Amino acid sequence: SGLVPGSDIDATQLQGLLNQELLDMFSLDECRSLVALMELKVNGRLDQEEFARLWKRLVHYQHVFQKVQTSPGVLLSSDLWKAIENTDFLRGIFISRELLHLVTLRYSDSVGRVSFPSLVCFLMRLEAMAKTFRNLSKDGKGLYLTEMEWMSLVMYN
Amino acid sequence: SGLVPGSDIDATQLQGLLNQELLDMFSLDECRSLVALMELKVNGRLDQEEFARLWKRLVHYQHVFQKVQTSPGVLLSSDLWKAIENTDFLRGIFISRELLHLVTLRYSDSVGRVSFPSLVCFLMRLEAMAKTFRNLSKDGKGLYLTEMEWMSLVMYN
Ligand SMILES: [Ca+2]
Numbered sequence: 001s002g003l004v005p006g007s008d009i010d011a012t013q014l015q016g017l018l019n020q021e022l023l024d025m026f027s028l029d030e031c032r033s034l035v036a037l038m039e040l041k042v043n044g045r046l047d048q049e050e051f052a053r054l055w056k057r058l059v060h061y062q063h064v065f066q067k068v069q070t071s072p073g074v075l076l077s078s079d080l081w082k083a084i085e086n087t088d089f090l091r092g093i094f095i096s097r098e099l100l101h102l103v104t105l106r107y108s109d110s111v112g113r114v115s116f117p118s119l120v121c122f123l124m125r126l127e128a129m130a131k132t133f134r135n136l137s138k139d140g141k142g143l144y145l146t147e148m149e150w151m152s153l154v155m156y157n
Numbered sequence: 158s159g160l161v162p163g164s165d166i167d168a169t170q171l172q173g174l175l176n177q178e179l180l181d182m183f184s185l186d187e188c189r190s191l192v193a194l195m196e197l198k199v200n201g202r203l204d205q206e207e208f209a210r211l212w213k214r215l216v217h218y219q220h221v222f223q224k225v226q227t228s229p230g231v232l233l234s235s236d237l238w239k240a241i242e243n244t245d246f247l248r249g250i251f252i253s254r255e256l257l258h259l260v261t262l263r264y265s266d267s268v269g270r271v272s273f274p275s276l277v278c279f280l281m282r283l284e285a286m287a288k289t290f291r292n293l294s295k296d297g298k299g300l301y302l303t304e305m306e307w308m309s310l311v312m313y314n
């Protein structure tokens with residue numbers, strides 16, 4: 001259990017596992033986002049391959065949070081740039097100062113702390129969204145999307 | 158309090174308010190999404206105008222959930238189409254069968270129920286994302302975005 005030997009794990013199961021193993025808790029909604037970001041065969045659950053992908057990232061994020069935190073479980077908003085730098089999955093991704101500011105507002109609590117579940121969500125989403133662009137763009141400058149393409153990319157994540 | 162008379166409400170305050178007034182609870186992360194979707198002056202809090210915008214929607218969603226639910230607090234996944242139909246803010250938005258399927262996977266729990274906080278998130282996000290497209294598209298068929306435009310739209314929400 002929480003090993004995914006040819007079996008699957010859904011968001012509800014994933015939540016119980018992450019909260020028991022890693023921990024500020026992961027919400028069920030966040031786990032549904034994690035499933036959405038990591039699915040290859042889209043069916044609302046993670047097979048062994050998809051789970052391995054998620055797990056490798058989670059292990060990595062644990063290390064990054066441990067390295068960057070000011071104290072056990074406390075990562076400061078002003079150190080979020082260091083979390084990005086320490087996340088190899090983001091290689092080649094450069095965000096603007098303004099975008100960093102927006103993500104800081106979105107992922108940090110009211111006293112300038114970023115929880116582990118919040119950091120996980122942010123780093124996985126940043127990677128997914130940056131890779132979508134880089135992979136779909138024909139010139140690396142812009143992206144053209146159909147309505148249906150746009151809506152699917154922005155709604156299932 | 159929870160009235161926002163020239164004052165502001167942040168996501169943490171918003172969470173306490175929504176959970177006390179409406180309720181399955183809103184997570185803090187969901188409240189940060191709600192703030193992001195409703196901001197006009199982007200600073201991580203809702204001023205009186207932004208809060209009014211959020212509140213009008215929330216009142217509407219309450220009515221829709223009450224109308225469509227199978228029993229107190231139980232909205233079935235298979236009835237999500239009826240929630241969309243009953244939400245005037247979505248007027249002019251048509252989603253595909255496939256997109257409906259994806260959102261069902263993303264917003265429903267493991268037994269085919271959609272919680273009130275999940276419905277709120279879904280209906281607000283659908284509206285925001287559809288309006289972005291409709292408003293940015295020059296022909297109503299496609300959208301061209303710069304990298305920076307793409308990343309900002311997909312990360313702050
Ligand atoms: Ca799958």
Ligand SMILES: [Ca+2]
Pocket residue numbers: 196197198199200201202203204207
């Ligand atoms: Ca504001």
